[PDB]
Design a binder for this molecule. Structure first.
Ligand SMILES: O=C[C@H](O)[C@@H](O)[C@H](O)[C@H](O)COP(=O)(O)O
Ligand SMILES: O=C[C@H](O)[C@@H](O)[C@H](O)[C@H](O)COP(=O)(O)O
Ligand SMILES: N[C@@H](CCC(=O)O)C(=O)O
Lengths: 657, 663
């Protein structure tokens, strides 16, 4: 889900400039949820903007943001020309994991049939059922099935039983969160508090951006405890200021790079155009707009695939020195010594991030000599897996906010393990709560299906492995071999990308099929698993990854001349075993596509369809073998008329149950 | 693929009776699959059996054993009434590897046009190219494309170049195997050694059964290295009469006798003058042991298929797995196979379960309760990937090897890998005498009875129960776990009747089969204790029905796989009453929200889901760590019924190896 609100204080904006700012903000957040959207602004058509802050208009519609963008426009009642000197507008895109994605369930929610309080919520309230029964007895009627509505009907209940006639908007929100259980990121708007916003979070991201041509009164807002000119953030001499509430930074970078990342239970409140926190550091974001633009590509997923030569280079920047063959991950300098005294490595993650652990498990075992265990986070938790004080637990999460991965982290901390975060988002929960960690530095990933995150995690774990063995004489040559492979890896990725048209042709032969089996073993077990997941996610074909050594134990019965098959056969120590699996497939009349090395003349002669990739080091070849399957999934989705950036039934980053 | 030989020594038998015994032997060996079969026996119609010992007749044919039987009795020149006081007959079913199926490529292979030496073979001789060239240069002409013919020609080469006129049959065979490379089980017969048999193996099972109405000299045959007298071989004491049965599977011997000798690699067993000695190039020896197998255990009975039998007899196979091991009277578990090692095992620091296919799923299905009751790290590894990665193993690891057959190559090689690194090894097998049961430090026979069906059904549930019993042993000294142990053991007490209850819903499963009859895919979703149920059911439906069933971990749906859900994709979800119930309900709401209309396997009393879901398979509730046995059986039956509807033969393997090398 996504949160975005635009508060222009004494910065005249017409009702069109505002709605186009809310929609544009949701477009920056759409990748976090695109099942429905909605906006909440001030209604009325009075020239004097002051007489309009008592009327709240809600425009909510099912579908992506573009469905709401048209619903907002071509309306017969809203006059888009009213100039507002002060105005607050809130917006929200929803990932409807439950129920119907109807406008009634979309946000902003309301507290009554006159819109006295409207709230946009990211998260879950684990006790909304109890809150629902309490509010219904007092005389409140519910309309939607969402847990967010209980937050709107409750902020009004605290307002209908206040002690003084002018209790601050903060005090009302404070009494609400004290009754809410679970995680949430909230942004309130009320007719009684015109222009005033309140932003509180608990286990969910929520920052506040600020723009103003004038100087700001401070760069460290002091948190308060139940508010003068030496306490609030505001322009000194004048009042011109623009705020940007948002659950992510991509929705604010376009307007400003000065945000204030809140913290759990911090109740921010903009009053009279002054930001004050209740219960900070105005900082510059280290992000360029170009990082979240498609550039000259028609989709984010395509950009992020073809930019892997660059994102791989950025992952190694300032960390790999090829002149002297040294590896230094600054994030682990203070802990690498104690990590080596531990006795087991555990990798915990979900989805594609879990595959990154599978793809590097073997080389981690080789260079550390430690037992390495790779766990799906959801099953890790279900089994109450045993963890000990001398375990080193890695948590792979591009977003750094995945629910199951994050709960596994707190589980391992409680048991005394040493925790390490491999993330792509700075300031994320997983990056903060681990003892140490590494930012893979692949840049923002906007596509729902992870591509560069996978290859960057891959490289990051290999660099860690290289540190763990830099004192072993017997492993020096093996280290050099791997590092030379990394030096040559960016260009070899470019070579794979130059086969784009040859992949697209093979896709024209498969798009009509219902299933495809992707078979590999050893280093390329993860490759066939990740490729199957990618084809599932964006093409909707029933693709499954099968461990090649397991074919003879049952799954081979499914192969006939009609079943499409993709096999991975690389020139490593399992080559002969992979050739035997291939012969078993052919015996069953299978006609597979084989991803193989360019020099594998034997395979190239005896197979019609081959995808010939350049040879790298055996423990890096998985990066080159997966890219064709990224490209194949892309072209298949295009051939089938589907969107590669907005696959049905889900969104990016699972931060709730 | 199947070997059987019958040696009657001073037990008079007619030619008919001998041939009927050979045919019947091969019939017990068909379930493994084959493409041709043949028999070898003494020819000639001289009423005095002593003179017919120099004429070996062969009858080999491509096709089923039944066709071979018709060919046997369809011989106008053969008199089936001659009585033989001494005779050796050999039989074989072939699964072609070298040379296409044909009469010439069928066994027994011969050494010359006069059949001076014949041999039956299971396996592959790797160096059969080099051996064939050598024998050709010495003046031996080959007539088949099989690697086996090199064996028959080579033994005649050793005989032709023997140093003394009375070199033993054993010595010749020893010289043969010392030149062979690969895997083999062999039985030899020759006109120069009438009435004698030689059997040897390397990487392929070979056993010998024995029957006699007289007392036998010993029950422990001592090995002889390079004197054969009355103190070194097996024989009836006061009389000569005795019968011997060579076989590659005990299923072909059990109806005649339950006293067997399992041979080991590079053993050369010889019967000379009705006495059995074991040669090999304190004192080591081979035991004559008693098998608890019965002919009834390998017969369909009233069932129409072995798959159906082995599914519906699971209430009895579970009981057999627990017999003598669980005392419900006082809530105690005792696996006698671990008595001399349970102490060491409890001092180790990690459990590793290594297996393939459904046996691997048995480890996944019990990983959680093993972690709970042992409190040790439990790692479950697919044997093939375990080997590819050179996984780290240590002297304080306990490694379990799960294998119904006890012969799977990758599992066996994983075992030898762990033994070299000093780990304590444990075999969980269902086949006495198998390689994995022998080479492990200790083990448990799951005692489910032989599995004749192509797919693993009772083996999976018996492995399941066996690992639960081991877990119950590991925590028997913990005061805090007494209640939990009792709960689990009262679940085992009630499990046989709960299985019958599930099997009584067969009709409901058939209705589900008709719904999926025309479907090409189905997703099976579950988590926790029922992750293994999803994987195992998905594999069954793939293996038996040949449709694309896939197991999906429910907690992973929102990470990608949920994109496959729509109004057309068939989905089966498992929702049981355990600690993951709420999370499973959540996954169900996620599927329905995207137009999915899944079939739900749930508890009989889950009134909420039964009402909100159209088709539900309602199984009885049991302990959470045992429910996996009840939830997998409906998927066993579904695979069975779908296959029948589609006209498939569930007892037909299909899954063949690589193509035949014609050369
Ligand atoms: O293509 C699939 C997605 O990339 C998905 O599998 C993702 O990896 C997880 O849903 C969360 O992983 P992160 O925590 O790294 O975002
Ligand atoms: O339906 C499953 C098959 O029976 C197969 O997957 C089997 O489980 C493996 O081939 C391992 O065999 P073993 O258990 O005999 O080692
Ligand atoms: N390799 C031998 C025997 C194969 C077997 O049945 O095991 C052949 O093909 O004739």
């Amino acid at each position: 889900c996504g949160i975005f609100a635009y508060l222009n204080y004494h910065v005249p904006r017409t009702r069109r400039e505002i709605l186009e700012t809310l929609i544009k903000g949701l477009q920056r957040l759409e990748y976090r949820g695109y099942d429905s959207a909605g906006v909440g602004f001030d209604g009325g058509n009075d020239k004097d903007w002051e007489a309009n802050a008592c009327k709240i208009q809600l425009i909510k519609k099912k579908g992506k943001v573009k469905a709401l963008d048209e619903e907002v426009h071509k309306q017969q009642d809203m006059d888009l020309d009213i100039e507002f000197d002060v105005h607050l507008g809130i917006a929200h895109t929803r990932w409807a994991t439950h129920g119907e994605p109807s406008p009634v369930n979309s946000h902003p929610q309301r507290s009554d049939k006159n819109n006295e309080f409207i709230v946009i919520h990211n998260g879950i309230i684990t006790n909304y059922k109890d809150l629902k029964k309490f509010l219904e007895s007092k005389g409140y009627d519910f309309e939607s099935e969402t847990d967010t509505e209980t937050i709107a009907k409750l902020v009004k209940y605290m307002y209908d039983n206040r002690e003084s006639q002018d209790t601050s908007f903060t005090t009302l929100v404070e009494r609400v969160i004290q009754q809410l259980e679970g995680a949430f990121a909230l942004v309130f708007k009320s007719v009684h508090f015109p222009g005033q916003a309140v932003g509180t979070r608990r286990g969910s991201p929520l920052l506040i951006g600020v723009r103003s041509e004038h100087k700001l009164s401070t760069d460290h807002i002091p948190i308060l405890y139940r508010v003068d000119s030496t306490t609030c953030l505001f322009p000194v001499e004048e009042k011109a200021v623009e705020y940007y509430f948002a659950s992510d930074a991509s929705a604010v970078i376009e307007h400003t790079n000065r945000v204030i990342f809140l913290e759990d239970d911090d109740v921010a409140a903009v009053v009279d155009g002054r930001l004050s926190i209740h219960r900070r550091a105005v900082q510059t974001l280290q992000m360029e707009l170009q990082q979240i633009m498609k550039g000259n590509f028609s989709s984010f997923m395509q950009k992020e695939i073809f930019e892997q030569p660059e994102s791989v280079v950025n992952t190694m920047r300032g960390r790999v020195n090829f002149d002297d063959y040294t590896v230094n991950l600054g994030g682990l300098k203070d802990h690498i010594k104690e990590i080596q005294r531990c006795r087991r490595l555990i990798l915990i993650a979900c989805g594609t991030s879990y595959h990154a652990g599978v793809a590097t498990r073997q080389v981690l075992e080789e260079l550390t000599e430690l037992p390495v265990m790779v766990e799906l986070a959801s099953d890790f938790l279900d089994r109450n897996t045993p963890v000990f004080r001398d375990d080193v637990c890695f948590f792979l999460s591009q977003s750094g906010e995945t629910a199951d991965t994050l709960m596994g982290l707190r589980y391992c901390k409680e048991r005394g393990a040493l925790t390490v975060g491999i993330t792509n988002t700075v300031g994320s929960s997983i990056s903060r709560e681990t003892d140490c960690g590494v930012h893979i530095n692949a840049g923002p990933e906007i596509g729902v299906a992870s591509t560069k995150a996978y290859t960057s995690q891959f490289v990051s774990l290999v660099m860690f492995a290289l540190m763990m063995c830099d004192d072993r004489i017997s492993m020096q040559e093996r280290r050099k071999e791997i590092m030379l492979g990394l030096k040559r890896l960016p260009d070899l990725i470019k070579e794979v990308l130059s086969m784009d048209d040859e992949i697209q042709k093979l896709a024209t032969e498969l798009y009509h099929q219902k299933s495809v089996l992707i078979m590999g073993r050893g280093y390329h077990y993860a490759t066939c698993l990740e490729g199957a997941l990618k084809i599932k996610e964006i093409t909707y074909m029933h693709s499954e990854g099968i461990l090649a050594g397991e074919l003879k134990h049952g799954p081979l019965a499914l192969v006939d001349k009609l079943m499409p098959v993709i096999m991975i056969i690389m020139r490593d120590h399992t080559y002969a075993k992979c050739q035997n699996a291939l012969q078993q497939v052919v015996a069953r009349q299978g006609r597979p596509v084989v991803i193989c090395d360019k020099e594998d003349t034997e395979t190239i002669k005896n197979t019609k369809r081959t995808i010939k990739v350049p040879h790298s080091v055996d423990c890096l070849q998985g990066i080159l073998s997966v890219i064709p399957l990224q490209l194949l999934a892309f072209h298949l989705a295009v051939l089938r008329g589907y969107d590669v950036d907005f696959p049905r039934n889900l969104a990016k980053s699972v931060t709730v149950e």
